[PDB]
Design a protein around this motif. Structure first.
Motif, PDB file in Angstrom:
ATOM      1  N   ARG A  75     -18.113   0.135  -0.146  1.00  0.00           N
ATOM      2  CA  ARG A  75     -17.653  -0.192   1.197  1.00  0.00           C
ATOM      3  C   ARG A  75     -16.307  -0.907   1.169  1.00  0.00           C
ATOM      4  O   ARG A  75     -16.026  -1.710   0.280  1.00  0.00           O
ATOM      5  N   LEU A  76     -15.480  -0.611   2.160  1.00  0.00           N
ATOM      6  CA  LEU A  76     -14.175  -1.222   2.360  1.00  0.00           C
ATOM      7  C   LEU A  76     -14.018  -1.585   3.824  1.00  0.00           C
ATOM      8  O   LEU A  76     -14.809  -1.160   4.674  1.00  0.00           O
ATOM      9  N   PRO A  77     -12.994  -2.377   4.159  1.00  0.00           N
ATOM     10  CA  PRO A  77     -12.833  -2.809   5.555  1.00  0.00           C
ATOM     11  C   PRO A  77     -11.811  -1.974   6.313  1.00  0.00           C
ATOM     12  O   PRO A  77     -12.172  -1.097   7.102  1.00  0.00           O
ATOM     13  N   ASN A  78     -10.530  -2.241   6.076  1.00  0.00           N
ATOM     14  CA  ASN A  78      -9.453  -1.517   6.736  1.00  0.00           C
ATOM     15  C   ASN A  78      -8.195  -1.644   5.889  1.00  0.00           C
ATOM     16  O   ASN A  78      -8.154  -2.399   4.914  1.00  0.00           O
ATOM     17  N   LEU A  79      -7.166  -0.896   6.275  1.00  0.00           N
ATOM     18  CA  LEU A  79      -5.896  -0.890   5.557  1.00  0.00           C
ATOM     19  C   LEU A  79      -4.849  -0.206   6.430  1.00  0.00           C
ATOM     20  O   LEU A  79      -5.139   0.262   7.536  1.00  0.00           O
TER      21      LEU A  79
ATOM     22  N   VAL B  49       0.857  -1.181   0.000  1.00  0.00           N
ATOM     23  CA  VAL B  49       0.000   0.000   0.000  1.00  0.00           C
ATOM     24  C   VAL B  49       0.897   1.235   0.000  1.00  0.00           C
ATOM     25  O   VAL B  49       1.489   1.585   1.023  1.00  0.00           O
ATOM     26  N   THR B  50       0.994   1.899  -1.151  1.00  0.00           N
ATOM     27  CA  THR B  50       1.864   3.062  -1.268  1.00  0.00           C
ATOM     28  C   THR B  50       1.275   4.313  -0.628  1.00  0.00           C
ATOM     29  O   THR B  50       2.037   5.210  -0.250  1.00  0.00           O
ATOM     30  N   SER B  51      -0.048   4.393  -0.491  1.00  0.00           N
ATOM     31  CA  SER B  51      -0.678   5.572   0.088  1.00  0.00           C
ATOM     32  C   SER B  51      -2.118   5.248   0.459  1.00  0.00           C
ATOM     33  O   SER B  51      -2.799   4.514  -0.262  1.00  0.00           O
ATOM     34  N   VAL B  52      -2.566   5.800   1.584  1.00  0.00           N
ATOM     35  CA  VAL B  52      -3.960   5.734   2.012  1.00  0.00           C
ATOM     36  C   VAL B  52      -4.348   7.107   2.535  1.00  0.00           C
ATOM     37  O   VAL B  52      -3.664   7.663   3.401  1.00  0.00           O
ATOM     38  N   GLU B  53      -5.438   7.661   2.009  1.00  0.00           N
ATOM     39  CA  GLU B  53      -5.854   9.011   2.374  1.00  0.00           C
ATOM     40  C   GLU B  53      -7.372   9.087   2.327  1.00  0.00           C
ATOM     41  O   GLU B  53      -7.968   8.968   1.252  1.00  0.00           O
ATOM     42  N   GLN B  54      -7.992   9.285   3.486  1.00  0.00           N
ATOM     43  CA  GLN B  54      -9.421   9.530   3.582  1.00  0.00           C
ATOM     44  C   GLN B  54      -9.665  10.976   3.997  1.00  0.00           C
ATOM     45  O   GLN B  54      -8.884  11.566   4.748  1.00  0.00           O
ATOM     46  N   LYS B  55     -10.758  11.548   3.490  1.00  0.00           N
ATOM     47  CA  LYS B  55     -11.085  12.940   3.747  1.00  0.00           C
ATOM     48  C   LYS B  55     -12.593  13.105   3.873  1.00  0.00           C
ATOM     49  O   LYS B  55     -13.352  12.489   3.110  1.00  0.00           O
ATOM     50  N   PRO B  56     -13.054  13.920   4.823  1.00  0.00           N
ATOM     51  CA  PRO B  56     -14.495  14.182   4.939  1.00  0.00           C
ATOM     52  C   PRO B  56     -14.959  15.154   3.861  1.00  0.00           C
ATOM     53  O   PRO B  56     -14.343  16.199   3.641  1.00  0.00           O
ATOM     54  N   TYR B  57     -16.049  14.801   3.188  1.00  0.00           N
ATOM     55  CA  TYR B  57     -16.627  15.628   2.141  1.00  0.00           C
ATOM     56  C   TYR B  57     -17.998  16.134   2.568  1.00  0.00           C
ATOM     57  O   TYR B  57     -18.605  15.633   3.520  1.00  0.00           O
ATOM     58  N   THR B  58     -18.481  17.141   1.845  1.00  0.00           N
ATOM     59  CA  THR B  58     -19.782  17.738   2.099  1.00  0.00           C
ATOM     60  C   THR B  58     -20.520  17.935   0.783  1.00  0.00           C
ATOM     61  O   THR B  58     -19.930  17.898  -0.300  1.00  0.00           O
ATOM     62  N   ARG B  59     -21.829  18.150   0.893  1.00  0.00           N
ATOM     63  CA  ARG B  59     -22.678  18.407  -0.263  1.00  0.00           C
ATOM     64  C   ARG B  59     -23.798  19.342   0.161  1.00  0.00           C
ATOM     65  O   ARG B  59     -24.585  19.005   1.050  1.00  0.00           O
ATOM     66  N   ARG B  60     -23.861  20.513  -0.467  1.00  0.00           N
ATOM     67  CA  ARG B  60     -24.910  21.471  -0.168  1.00  0.00           C
ATOM     68  C   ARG B  60     -26.209  21.077  -0.870  1.00  0.00           C
ATOM     69  O   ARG B  60     -26.186  20.437  -1.924  1.00  0.00           O
TER      70      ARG B  60
END
Length: 793
Positions: free
Chosen positions: A460-464, A274-285
């Motif tokens: 859906r995904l589990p973990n990493l 796994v070279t990179s893992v990045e999660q970010k919170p998004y929004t929608r108006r």
DNA sequence: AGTGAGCGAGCTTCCGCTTGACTT
């Protein structure tokens, strides 16, 4: 106590106005305009028709004085208002707060001729406070706004009844041109040209289900896709260099069936990290409330309704008192509606899903007018969609359900979530540093989504872990770059709104108008232009380009504003537009010499041949290929070298089927349509010579001929027998007719030849000039030389 | 007395506002 007469536009609004204002009040409706320019020579009034030149309804030489005549259907409504006016004290004109309604006020004034004081009542939202405040504080007629409505009504009149007759004499009769429809058709034609010049490119993608279950087996099944390989990226459809072939080839790498098929087969499973893992919170108006354009677009997307269908339903909902006005160009909700919207959400969905501050949507449309509020449920308290299922229809319920959700969701909290973006890297078994990638999204806080339904595309995904070991199902699929999609009823309307073209009362009618005149065909759920549209748009682009420019409608509105505030005279711009003048803005018609000169001075200088000849491409030999229009149906045409006259080129033609769309006319299909028979049925190819045999119907009778590749040989013919039919003859029967003059032998008595054929009166053999009749068609092939001599003597 | 050639009349069309209701 003064008895005041009120005139509104909508009759169902008149009932509500008469409820807010009680005894000393009489409220009636006018049902829109009462007068308009005469549409045809029959509507022109008898006196003013027979004498002058009033085909336009605007005798331009007399200071652009319009000719207004009352509609015969509203003629009984006008007399009804004149009778009620003689029994009141004052007259309130209560039309809409738009420049069209101001003219309706003026038209009611000039028609009823009230010998009684008049005042102008205006209102946006229709509630008890909004109309009581408006009735207590009236206004005066805005003459500057009325003249700005007459300026555009005459402008669309000069555009209409002066340019469309040019199309009659240069394209086809009964056609039409306009400020609104010609641009929409030019949009459809321009989009079709983008597909007609679009070249496709094929690539190959490799899907893979990552098997990371050996890490943490705490349900789990994850799919991935390849992203890049060393200094080369997996080429996708995003490298079409804007509808071409490709560009920047050093960064990406094209994949075929064997190249990409080797990567899926080169490593079923591999030791990848796994070279990179990045999660970010998004929004929608949330979306703004419904106006007419946004309702017609979402009804087509979520309910598969049409503009003509959507508006007919909303009319039923409005006239029964379930929603507000459906013909609106404003997303503004009234204060009462917001209180109804937030209370409804607080009671049903809860206090956590509402918003702290009331949401206001102030994204105005190009040259909007803001006379009504957004389409929202009626009443000071919204009636729940479930409380109306027993009274609404199936289409009424689904539409009201969509309108109710839009209003409530417009005041609810934003949607908060979180997306998952993981990248997989490593090396290949064959020898390549490949890198995979997989993106996912997961919702967290619904907010407004609890009443609405790709802001929630989930994977859906589990973990990493960053740098964790993963293991790689493999499949390599191929794709081709898709052309830009055509316009639908929704995508076209949102395109005109972005240009400031059309109004809420014309959206559903533009589609019907460009259809009923052969300009566009509705292929299921897409608007396909015809060859007449390419000829009409092609003509207007070259001789009236300023009239069909997208900015022309915005250029008119900026000129009508100077007449609405009072800076420019009404007649001044029409004079410059129709007659010319060096006071042009950019490349305006005034700087061109006026519309009259641009019409009367060009009739001599338009080449209808080139106008109806639509060149599509050049064939493999370089010869241009046209599409003639109006010459008894559209067909292909091209100039090829002539066999008889050298130099003078001869045209070969090919009839086109009416069900063929313009983007499907490829050069590969063109030559195949040229090889098709002219007017007869094709039977096959004769192997003895290689010529195509056909069966036609000519001056004499049904016959069969061969075609020759363009000693000097003539095309061999052959007339079919009485036992044959024009559509039943086969290549076998034909090949016998082509050699029908059969010399059964020479007769030693007279040295002449004996040949058996078939004519008008059946089979027969001729002995030079003497010919005897036969009794069987098949016997001219089974006749022996001996049998022919026994009867010839 | 019925048909209906061959010549060729008078017509077409623009944007926007907005519900209309008969009889044979």
């Amino acid at each position: 106590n003064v008895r005041r007469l009120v005139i509104v536009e909508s009759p169902t609004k008149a009932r509500k106005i008469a409820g807010y204002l009680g005894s000393n009040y009489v409220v009636e409706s006018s049902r829109g305009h009462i007068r308009d320019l005469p549409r045809n020579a029959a509507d022109v009034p008898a006196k003013f028709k027979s004498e002058p030149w009033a085909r336009l309804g605007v005798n331009v030489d007399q200071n652009f004085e319009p000719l207004y005549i009352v509609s015969p259907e509203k003629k009984s409504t006008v007399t009804e208002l004149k009778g009620l006016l003689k029994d009141v004290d004052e007259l309130y004109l209560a039309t809409d707060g738009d420049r069209e309604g101001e003219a309706i006020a003026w038209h009611l004034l000039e028609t009823l001729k009230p010998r009684v004081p008049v005042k102008r009542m205006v209102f946006h939202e229709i509630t008890e406070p909004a109309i009581r405040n408006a009735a207590e504080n009236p206004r005066d007629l805005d003459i500057a706004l009325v003249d700005a409505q007459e300026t555009r009504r005459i402008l669309d009149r000069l555009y209409g009844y002066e340019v469309s007759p040019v199309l009659w004499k240069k394209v086809a009769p009964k056609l039409s041109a306009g400020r609104v429809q010609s641009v929409a058709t030019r949009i459809i034609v321009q989009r079709e040209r983008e597909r007609m010049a679009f070249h496709s490119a094929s690539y190959w993608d490799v899907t893979a289900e990552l098997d990371a279950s050996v890490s943490d087996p705490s349900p789990p099944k994850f799919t991935a896709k390849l992203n890049t390989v060393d200094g080369r990226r997996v080429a996708t459809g995003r490298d079409f260099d804007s509808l071409g072939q490709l560009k920047r080839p050093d960064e990406v790498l094209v994949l075929d069936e064997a190249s990409a098929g080797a990567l899926a087969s080169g490593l079923r499973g591999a030791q990848l990290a796994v070279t990179s893992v990045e999660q970010k919170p998004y929004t929608r108006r949330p979306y703004a409330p419904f106006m007419t354009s946004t309702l017609q677009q979402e009804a087509a997307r979520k309910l598969r309704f049409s503009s003509e269908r959507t508006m007919s339903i909303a009319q039923r909902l409005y006239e029964n008192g379930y929603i507000t006005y459906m013909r609106t160009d404003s997303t503004t909700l009234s204060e009462s509606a917001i209180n109804a919207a937030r209370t409804q959400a607080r009671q049903l969905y809860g206090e956590e899903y509402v918003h702290p501050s009331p949401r206001q949507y102030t994204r105005k449309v190009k040259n909007a007018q803001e006379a009504h509020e957004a389409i929202r449920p009626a009443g000071d308290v919204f009636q729940t969609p479930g409380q109306l299922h027993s009274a609404l229809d199936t289409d009424e319920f689904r539409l009201y359900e969509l309108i109710w959700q839009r209003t409530v969701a417009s005041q609810m909290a934003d949607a908060r979530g979180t997306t998952l973006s993981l990248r997989i890297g490593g090396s290949a078994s064959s020898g390549e540093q490949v890198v995979f990638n997989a993106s996912g999204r997961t919702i967290t806080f619904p907010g407004f989504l609890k009443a609405y339904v790709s802001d929630d595309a989930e994977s859906r995904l589990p973990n990493l872990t960053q740098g964790q070991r993963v293991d790689a199902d493999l499949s390599a699929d191929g794709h081709q770059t898709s052309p830009p999609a055509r316009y639908t009823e929704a995508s076209l309307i949102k395109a005109l709104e972005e240009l400031g073209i059309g109004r809420p009362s014309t959206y559903s009618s533009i589609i019907k108008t460009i259809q009923d005149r052969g300009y566009v065909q509705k292929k299921g759920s897409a608007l396909v232009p015809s060859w007449v549209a390419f000829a009409v748009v092609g003509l207007l682009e070259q001789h009236f380009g300023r009239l069909v420019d997208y900015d022309f409608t915005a250029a008119m509105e900026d000129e009508l504003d100077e007449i609405a505030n009072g800076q420019e005279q009404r007649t001044n711009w029409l004079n410059n537009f129709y007659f010319g003048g060096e006071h042009g803005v950019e490349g305006s018609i005034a700087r061109a010499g006026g519309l009259k000169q641009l019409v009367g001075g060009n009739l001599e200088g338009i080449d209808a041949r080139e106008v109806n000849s639509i060149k599509v491409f050049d064939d493999s030999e370089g010869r241009p290929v046209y599409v003639r229009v109006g010459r008894n149906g559209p067909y292909l045409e091209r100039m090829v070298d002539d066999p008889d006259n050298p130099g003078e080129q001869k045209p070969q033609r090919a009839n086109l089927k009416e069900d063929l769309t313009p983007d499907e006319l490829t050069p590969e299909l063109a030559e195949k349509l040229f090889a098709t028979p002219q007017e007869g049925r094709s039977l096959g190819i004769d192997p003895e010579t290689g010529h195509e045999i056909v069966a036609k119907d000519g001056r004499f009778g049904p016959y069969v001929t061969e075609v020759l590749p363009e000693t000097g040989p003539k095309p061999r013919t052959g007339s079919l027998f009485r036992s044959m039919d024009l559509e039943t003859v086969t290549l076998e029967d034909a090949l016998k007719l082509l050699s029908l003059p059969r010399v059964v032998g020479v007769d030693p008595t007279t040295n002449e030849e004996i040949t058996a054929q078939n004519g008008r009166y059946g089979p027969y053999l001729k002995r030079g000039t003497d010919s005897r009749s036969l009794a069987t068609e098949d016997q001219i092939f089974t006749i022996t030389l001996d049998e022919a001599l026994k009867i010839y003597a």
